Amino acid sequence: FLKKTMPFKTTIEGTVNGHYFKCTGKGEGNPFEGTQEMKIEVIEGGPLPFAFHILSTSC
């Protein structure tokens, strides 16, 4: 069911220190080579009042 190059899509909803936010994202990678890149857009609650870095492993 998996290919050499695969797209992915994400939706993210959360609250951090009382700040609500929503993100969407679109990406592409090579699952077997283990590489990927994605673009994340804060659609609600932007600009984020905290470092994006804490969301990195959840994208």
């Binding site: 069911f1 951090v16 699952p31 932007g46 984020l48 870095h53 959840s58």
Partner: protein
């Protein structure tokens, strides 16, 4: 985004084995300065496209810390330890956020990965390492748009080999 890992040394791929149904993961990341970041995620396959749905709860981040100040530098690469527990996969890793002033703000990830296939349908991997390099390629718009890259490798400790025939 655990579908994107290069596994070496014949290590079974828990995530690639989980399709077409997919998998979920649950995680709590504890930061050394008291912040917590809890997330749950569903991974599914819609046609040719992987679909992620993420829920996040974060709390107790210090107002004067790099996170809430939005004065974080960049992630160092990290290595997760991955092994079977309760018939599913447990992960743990220490990550380190480079910060201005020569600081490293570290955190401890506690993850459970859950296939949507029964454990009977799966070849469970042995204890191994998963190297993750996460990089913000650009901050397209401040606090609004980000490009993020990742390379991941599932491997054994090849640099320092066993004298007892262990992986």
């Amino acid at each position: 985004s655990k579908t994107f890992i290069k596994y070496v040394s014949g290590i079974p791929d828990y995530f690639k084995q989980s399709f077409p149904e997919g998998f979920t993961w649950e995680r709590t990341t504890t930061y050394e300065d008291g912040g917590f970041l809890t997330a749950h995620q569903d991974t599914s396959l819609d046609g040719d496209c992987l679909v992620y749905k993420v829920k996040i709860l974060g709390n107790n981040f210090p107002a004067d810390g790099p996170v809430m100040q939005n004065k974080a530098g960049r992630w160092e690469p990290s290595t997760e330890i991955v092994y079977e527990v309760d018939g599913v996969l447990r992960g743990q890793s220490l990550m380190a956020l480079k910060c201005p002033g020569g600081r490293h703000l570290t955190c401890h990830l506690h993850t459970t990965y859950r296939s949507k296939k029964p454990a009977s349908a799966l070849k469970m991997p042995g204890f191994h390492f998963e190297d993750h390099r996460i990089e913000i390629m650009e901050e397209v718009e401040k606090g609004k748009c980000y490009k993020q890259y990742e390379a991941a490798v599932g491997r054994y400790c090849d640099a320092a080999p066993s004298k007892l025939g262990h992986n």
